[PDB]
């Protein structure tokens, strides 16, 4: 009767969660004055990519940017002057993710080759060479993030994630429990826990130390494409293909707000917060990004100017700008 | 701008020049995508097979009349494919391969073709359809051990159109079965699309070597369609 008690446990989850909540965040935040209309102006347009872009990542110094594209090149941009610090050719032109190390020393990439390539930017030779080629996944990689410049976290299309040690090159830890493809990651600000969304409308909160799924959140109805912690680390926002974002609290273990509107029908490709977490920026398939109030769930602004599908979005650490990269091979910086 | 800034700008200009050179070189070639099922013979569509960029996905290169062709096959993925398929939305065409000899899996092939045809990302991508193992189908229909109508009742109530395409004058039942399969596939294809993308059915064998010519001609036709639609002529 293992199956029967499985749905019994899932049923009591409903009772426990209902007993946990008495009201909604809308009533609590109704007293807050609206943020108002926000108009974001484009400052720089980083051009040079000759193919559609899937991923980007800002630097810790809030100036350097890394972009990946189907052209087969990783491009490092000095966002202040729109220069090109580095152009790294790739072994495989199919890449779906990229990462910039917190120390600014290494750059990760991967895609439809089941291998995560790590490049050392700072070398005595003066060029960029493949420092490592982590292999062992049996599916396409969807995202990868540097933990502390010596270990990395990836998620693949074989419905699992992994924590690799760069020096050894082997999977130090393996995280399993997802039914469908894992498509997003988000490291906690303290780099102790991380959430990951899968193609089952399911997000999972994992502990990186013990390597086990601490919590599971549901509530969407389609594939999950993006995820991002709240700046304080006690909550996270999730984007899915059903044209809606959802805010989850780790401790409350429930829905908090649902960001959706009748006008939008297209899926969501990227989700990011602001420095203080007040603004939620989400890239859509409607060729433009939307900016919602986190505590009000209303469309506070629209970022338009892209003439193709928006595929990557990133807010800098300083919070002074947000960079968006779409399938037109153009990175636009807004502030 | 100081001296170091000028030197950095010069470095960026050199990187840009290399990028444009690589981009035009890549634009010179032409890309394709291979789709199929197990034991469908999709690995022998082109008589020469290249191990270039051996990874979780197979990559092959060939050339016809001094134009290149990149063909990408996937075998390392799982049953689900709708997630990574969005990568192959700018290819010139999609080569679909169907084993017409057997009849149990024809419905599965038709369902797969329906899924590919109506995919949200492959709306404007044309499909070149290959019906592999035509000799095996001919042998099966000549032997008569496996009745065709056991799976498709509408085959019995179907008459061959007055199109005497087969020059060799093969057995009429062979032609009837071939035309029935092609009719099914083109009915699945034509039901949607409104002319944005069209299918090019073809018949091939395990011994046929004139497969590169058909792919080249279909790619030429597709590029012609793109150019005509660009000039608002469709």
């Amino acid at each position, epitope marked *: 009767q293992l199956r029967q008690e499985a749905e019994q446990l899932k049923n009591q989850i409903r009772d426990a969660r209902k007993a946990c909540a008495d009201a909604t965040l809308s009533q609590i935040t109704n007293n807050i004055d609206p943020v108002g209309r926000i108009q974001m102006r484009t400052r720089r347009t980083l051009r040079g990519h000759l193919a559609k872009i899937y991923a980007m990542h800002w630097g810790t110094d809030s*100036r*350097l940017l890394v972009s990946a594209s189907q052209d087969g090149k990783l491009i490092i941009w*000095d966002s202040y002057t729109t*220069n090109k*610090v*580095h152009a790294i050719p790739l072994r495989s032109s199919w890449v779906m993710t990229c990462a910039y190390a917190p120390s*600014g020393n290494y750059v990760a990439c991967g895609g439809l080759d089941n291998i995560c390539s790590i490049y050392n930017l700072k070398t*005595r*030779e*003066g*060029n960029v060479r493949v420092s490592r080629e982590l292999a062992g996944h049996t599916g396409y990689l969807s995202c990868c993030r540097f933990l502390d410049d010596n270990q990395i976290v990836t998620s693949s299309g074989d419905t699992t994630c992994a924590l690799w040690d760069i020096e050894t090159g082997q999977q130090t830890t393996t995280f399993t429990g997802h039914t469908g493809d894992v498509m997003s990651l988000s490291l906690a600000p303290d780099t102790r826990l991380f959430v990951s969304g899968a193609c089952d409308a399911s997000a999972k909160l994992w502990d990186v130390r013990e390597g086990m799924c601490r919590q599971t959140f549901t509530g969407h109805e389609s594939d999950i494409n993006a995820i991002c912690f709240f700046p304080n680390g006690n909550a996270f926002a999730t984007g899915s293909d059903d044209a809606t974002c959802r805010l989850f609290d780790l401790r409350a273990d429930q829905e908090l707000m649902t960001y959706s509107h009748d006008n939008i029908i297209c899926g969501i490709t990227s989700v990011s917060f602001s420095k203080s977490g007040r603004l939620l920026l989400a890239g859509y398939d409607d060729f433009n990004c939307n900016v919602w109030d986190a505590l009000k769930a209303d469309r506070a602004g629209v970022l338009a100017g892209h003439d193709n599908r928006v595929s990557c979005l990133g807010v800098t650490d300083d919070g002074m700008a947000v960079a968006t990269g779409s399938w037109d091979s153009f990175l636009k910086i807004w502030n | 701008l*100081s*001296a*170091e*800034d*000028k*030197a*950095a700008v*010069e*470095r960026s200009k*050199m990187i840009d020049r290399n990028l444009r050179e690589d981009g035009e070189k890549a634009r010179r070639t032409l890309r394709l995508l291979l789709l199929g099922a197990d034991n469908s013979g999709k690995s022998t569509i082109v008589k020469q097979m290249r191990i270039l960029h051996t990874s979780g996905i197979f990559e092959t290169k060939f050339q016809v009349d001094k134009v290149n062709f990149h063909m990408f096959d996937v075998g390392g993925q799982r049953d689900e494919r709708r997630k990574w398929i969005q990568c192959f939305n700018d290819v010139t065409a999609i080569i679909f391969v169907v084993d017409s000899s057997d009849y149990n899996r024809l419905q599965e092939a038709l369902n797969d073709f329906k899924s590919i045809w109506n995919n949200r990302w492959l709306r404007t991508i044309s499909v070149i359809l290959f019906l592999n193992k035509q000799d095996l189908l001919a042998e099966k229909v000549l032997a008569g051990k496996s009745k065709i109508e056991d799976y498709f009742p509408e085959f019995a109530r179907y008459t061959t159109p007055e199109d005497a395409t087969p020059e060799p004058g093969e057995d009429p039942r062979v032609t009837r079965a071939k035309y029935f399969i092609r009719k099914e596939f083109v009915d699945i294809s034509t039901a949607s699309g409104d002319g944005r993308h069209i299918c090019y059915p073809h018949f091939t064998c395990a011994v046929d070597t004139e497969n590169a010519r058909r792919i080249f001609n279909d790619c030429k036709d597709i590029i012609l369609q793109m150019n005509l639609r660009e000039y608002n002529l469709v």
Partner: single-chain antibody, 231 residues
Framework: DVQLVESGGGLVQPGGSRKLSCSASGFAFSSFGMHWVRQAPEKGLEWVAYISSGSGTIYYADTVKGRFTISRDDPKNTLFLQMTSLRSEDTAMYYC??????????????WGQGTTLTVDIVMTQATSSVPVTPGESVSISCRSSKSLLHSNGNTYLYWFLQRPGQSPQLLIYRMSNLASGVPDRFSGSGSGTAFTLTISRLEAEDVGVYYCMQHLEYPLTFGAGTKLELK
């Protein structure tokens, strides 16, 4: 692996001609700018010529402008210096200097061995020679006619250590950071036109001349040099 070897020096006559060759191995020479730097036997370092990456911008010193020619050869990784009408002031040691320029580069990290050939902004060091005691902290300072701080929040000052019979290295670049391989006991500071470099605890390998360079392509002037004598 990084090696730069110079050749072509020797005895010449005034009004003659000479060719200097710099062979570089171990790194991507085609992506590094190169410098030819002169050092008189009893005076100190002096900039001569600069060739950019990809053989683009070319810069010559005022003294050797119109007489010295600098050229690059990527396929064989070689730097050529043609000298015509040699004079009595051209006798000195010539060094091949590596350089690279991007946002966070170190454009004077490596220096060649150099060869001996025999026939603006003023950058003044505070002293010329000071005695030091091993184990304690010493300080050096130098000033410039014009403030090196730029509009983009960058000050272009470089510090070089030359031990006797050894090619000078790069210690501190732009005042921003310590070059790779330099022990984290050297410290750079200052502002405007006046800058200082401090050593917390010397050793036996810190004996040598200390130069400070401002970075403007046309002048590219060095400092006087304040050698430290062990005592």
């Amino acid at each position: 692996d990084v090696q730069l070897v110079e050749s072509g020096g020797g005895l010449v006559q005034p009004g003659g001609s000479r060719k200097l060759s710099c062979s570089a191995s171990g790194f991507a020479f085609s992506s590094f700018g190169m410098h030819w730097v002169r050092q008189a036997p009893e005076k100190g370092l002096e900039w001569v010529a600069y060739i950019s990456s990809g053989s683009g911008t070319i810069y010559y010193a005022d003294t050797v402008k119109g007489r010295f020619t600098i050229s690059r050869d990527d396929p064989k990784n070689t730097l050529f210096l043609q000298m015509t009408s040699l004079r009595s002031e051209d006798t000195a040691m010539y060094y091949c200097v590596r350089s690279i320029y991007y946002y966070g580069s170190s454009p004077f990290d490596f220096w060649g061995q150099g060869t001996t050939l025999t026939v603006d902004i003023v950058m003044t060091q505070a002293t010329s020679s000071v005695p030091v005691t091993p184990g304690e902290s010493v300080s050096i300072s130098c000033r410039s006619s014009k403030s090196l701080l730029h509009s983009n929040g960058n000050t272009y000052l470089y510090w070089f250590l030359q031990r006797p019979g050894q090619s000078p290295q790069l210690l501190i670049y732009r005042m921003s950071n310590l070059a790779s391989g330099v022990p984290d006991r050297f410290s750079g500071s200052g502002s405007g036109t006046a800058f200082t470099l401090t050593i917390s605890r010397l050793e036996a390998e810190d004996v040598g001349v200390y130069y400070c360079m401002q970075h403007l392509e046309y002048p590219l002037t060095f400092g006087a040099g304040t050698k430290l004598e062990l005592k």
